[PDB]
């Protein structure tokens, strides 16, 4: 009867944490944000349509110049576009046709990809010899690579379907540290602006906050009902949003250790694939499976407008790192850039 | 102006080359026919792929590109990665026949089949059904210690259909059981009734004739019925 006493003490501990969190709830952001003026019906229009793909787009990423963007599709092609003049700077054929993720280096050097082939392939773009070659291929997961992002040009963190996260180093090619403690598939992650720590979504409806240098989980947030598809930080780093398959977006604060607010509406039955903020931190953009992109407000929770468009589900969403535009990938192979 | 114009011309040529090669890629790509091989557990799905990593297999018949993918290297928490395959023309679903006794992974396989058939993104993908381990099924049934009727009582009420194609040297009960499993998979497929996708059963590997020929005929059928139904002739 050891497992019983252990589970009892664990449940009790959980209860104490629940109550300690419930005690900090003296007001709501919904209560105090009454005086803040609303957004108004402020709408975007398609300034550019980037078409080049044969199959469905699974992901994209903006570069730090806000100019280039990488997009990967399930045909095994990786296209590096240019936002202004709608060209194609590079096309890199992949080894595996199926690719679920892509990432951009902050200095513009490397481009990463990954998918059901379990291996995170790093591609160099600065080759004086010419075209692109596989620079370093990183393999340590027993499951598919769901997402990954560059810390810098040297070390890169990955998320996977073997329940774990791992921080790699490109030069040795090994795992510097291994993050375990999630329950199901780790669907997505987002770094910090100061990159000391990063959150992750999982299939147990709980987002965890880890610390990159030490490797430990500081806080576990359980607010959603089903699988968390995407997670994105806030401009100052003190909050983050998670989309899920419970058709709700939620805002969580790190210093409050609990879910502050839920954005939902009753006419939604389908999941949220992707989220992001703007430059200022006022707008929360979310793609859904009802083929639209709903633009919510971060303070008043009323949708200011909507983004029409894609004929099938929206897989990915990104915002330029100066906040100049928004980009939405779908399963109809088309990218739409908005303003 | 002075050198941005050259950038335009450089990027133009790069765009041309990429555009060209990409156009050459579209032909082979769209001509390639993608297939998803999956099986529940102890399914004999490693034999067909014996008939890139170890996962992926591209095999060629009659100058018609087939590109199979095996998912055997992943965990069985399936609901996130199976959405990645909605363009695959057919899902080859291979199930063992004598696993009714011990557990009942035959019932598990049936469950998985129903789940795939009703899944909201995979409402367009026809399932080619391979019923495997025919001789082994026959052995277990004639041995009789392992009774199907324990795990399927309604088998007592199901008799041999009118379209029976008996091969000689076989128990009519064994044949009836065989057709009963086949019908158990068919009725699930006929429950939807929209006719967007169909399940083609087969019997396999008691005779080791090349099941690619069946795969061939059925793939032809799937695409032919796609155009046929879209043109409202069906």
């Amino acid at each position, epitope marked *: 009867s050891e497992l019983d006493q252990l*589970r009892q003490e664990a449940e009790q501990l*959980k209860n104490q944490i*629940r109550d300690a969190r419930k005690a900090c709830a003296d007001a709501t952001l919904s209560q105090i944000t009454n005086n803040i003026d609303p957004v108004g019906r402020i709408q975007m229009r398609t300034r550019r349509t980037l078409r080049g793909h044969l199959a469905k787009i699974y992901a994209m990423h903006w570069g730090t110049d806000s100019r280039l963007l990488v997009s990967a599709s399930q045909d095994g092609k990786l296209i590096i576009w240019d936002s202004y003049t709608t060209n194609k700077v590079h096309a890199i054929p992949l080894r595996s046709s199926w690719v679920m993720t892509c990432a951009y280096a902050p200095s513009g050097n490397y481009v990463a990809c990954g998918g059901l082939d379990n291996i995170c392939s790093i591609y160099n773009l600065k080759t004086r010899e010419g075209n692109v070659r596989v620079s370093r291929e990183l393999a340590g997961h027993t499951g598919y690579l769901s997402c990954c992002r560059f810390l810098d040009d040297n070390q890169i963190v990955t998320s996977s379907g073997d*329940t774990t996260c791992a921080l790699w180093d490109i030069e040795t090619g090994q795992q510097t540290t291994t993050f375990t403690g999630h*329950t*199901g598939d780790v669907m997505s992650l987002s770094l910090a602006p100061d990159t000391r720590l990063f959150v992750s979504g999982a*299939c*147990d*409806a*709980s987002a965890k906050l880890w610390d990159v240098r030490e490797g430990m989980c500081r806080q576990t947030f*359980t607010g959603h*009902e*089903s*699988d968390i598809n995407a997670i994105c930080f806030f401009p100052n780093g003190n909050a983050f949003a998670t989309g899920s*398959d*419970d*058709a709700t977006c939620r805002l969580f604060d790190l210093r409050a250790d609990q879910e502050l607010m839920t954005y939902s509406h009753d006419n939604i*039955i389908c999941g949220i694939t992707s989220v992001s903020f703007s430059k200022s931190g006022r707008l929360l953009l979310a793609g859904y499976d009802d083929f639209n992109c709903n633009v919510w407000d971060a303070l008043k929770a009323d949708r200011a407008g909507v983004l029409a468009g894609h004929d099938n589900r929206v897989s990915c969403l990104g915002v330029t790192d100066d906040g100049m535009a928004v980009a939405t990938g779908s399963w109809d192979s088309f990218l739409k850039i908005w303003n | 102006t002075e050198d941005q114009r050259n950038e335009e011309k450089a990027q133009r040529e790069a765009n041309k080359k990429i555009e060209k090669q990409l156009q050459k890629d579209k032909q082979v790509y769209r001509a390639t026919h993608r297939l998803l091989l999956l099986g529940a557990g102890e399914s004999g799905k490693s034999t067909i792929v014996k008939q890139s990593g170890i996962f992926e297999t591209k095999f060629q018949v009659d100058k018609v590109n087939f590109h199979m993918f095996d998912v055997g290297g992943q965990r*069985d*928490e*399936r*609901r996130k990665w199976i959405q990645c395959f909605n363009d695959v023309t057919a899902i080859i679903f291979v199930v063992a026949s004598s696993s009714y006794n*011990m*557990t*009942n*992974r035959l*019932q*598990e396989a049936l*469950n*998985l089949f*129903k*789940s*795939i058939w*009703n*899944n*909201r993104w995979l409402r367009t993908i026809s399932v080619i059904l391979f019923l495997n381990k025919q001789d082994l099924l026959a052995e277990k049934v004639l041995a009789g210690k392992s009774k199907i009727e*324990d*795990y*399927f*009582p*309604e088998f007592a009420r199901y008799t041999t259909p009118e379209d029976a194609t008996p091969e000689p040297g076989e128990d009519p009960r064994v044949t009836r059981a065989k057709y009963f499993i086949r019908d158990e998979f068919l009725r699930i497929s006929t429950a939807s009734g929209d006719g967007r996708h169909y399940c083609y059963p087969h019997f396999t590997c008691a005779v080791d004739t090349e099941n690619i020929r069946r795969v061939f005929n059925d793939c032809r059928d799937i695409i032919q019925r796609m155009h046929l139904r879209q043109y409202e002739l069906l």
Partner: nanobody, 128 residues
Framework: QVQLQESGGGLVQPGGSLRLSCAASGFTFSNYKMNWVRQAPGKGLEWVSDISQSGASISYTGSVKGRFTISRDNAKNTLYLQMNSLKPEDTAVYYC?????????????????????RGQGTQVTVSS
């Protein structure tokens, strides 16, 4: 958070009856397809019975046709499994697991542990 607590269960004579209950909370219980999944001692799991949103669509594994009655109470967020006329093959741990997706017909749950939408289970054992 999400938890599903298996209650009931215990040592009962074969041919007897036992009513399994599952109390759910933390989610809008009305929408989610619930089902009962078992794990036999020393053998892998097998799905047993499911119940749909409205309480209409109900399937059983063929071994337990009709003698098991699954009923849902949406009015207070609680689930019920009525077992009648037990068999010696029924002795196992009965978990109540929900299907992960809202508003659907498909489920992927018999897949083994560290799946969060499943409870700890109760012990049902067939008497001697």
């Amino acid at each position: 958070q999400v938890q599903l607590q298996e209650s009931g269960g215990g040592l009962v004579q074969p041919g007897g009856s036992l009513r399994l209950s599952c109390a759910a909370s933390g989610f809008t219980f009305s929408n989610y397809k619930m089902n009962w999944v078992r794990q036999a001692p020393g053998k892998g799991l097998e799905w047993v019975s499911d119940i749909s949103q409205s309480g209409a669509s109900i399937s059983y594994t063929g071994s337990v046709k009709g003698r098991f009655t699954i009923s849902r109470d949406n009015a207070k967020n609680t689930l019920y499994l009525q077992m009648n006329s037990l068999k010696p093959e029924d002795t196992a741990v009965y978990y109540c697991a929900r299907c992960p997706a809202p508003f659907t017909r498909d489920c992927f749950d018999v897949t083994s542990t560290t799946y969060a939408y499943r409870g700890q289970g109760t012990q049902v054992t067939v008497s001697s």
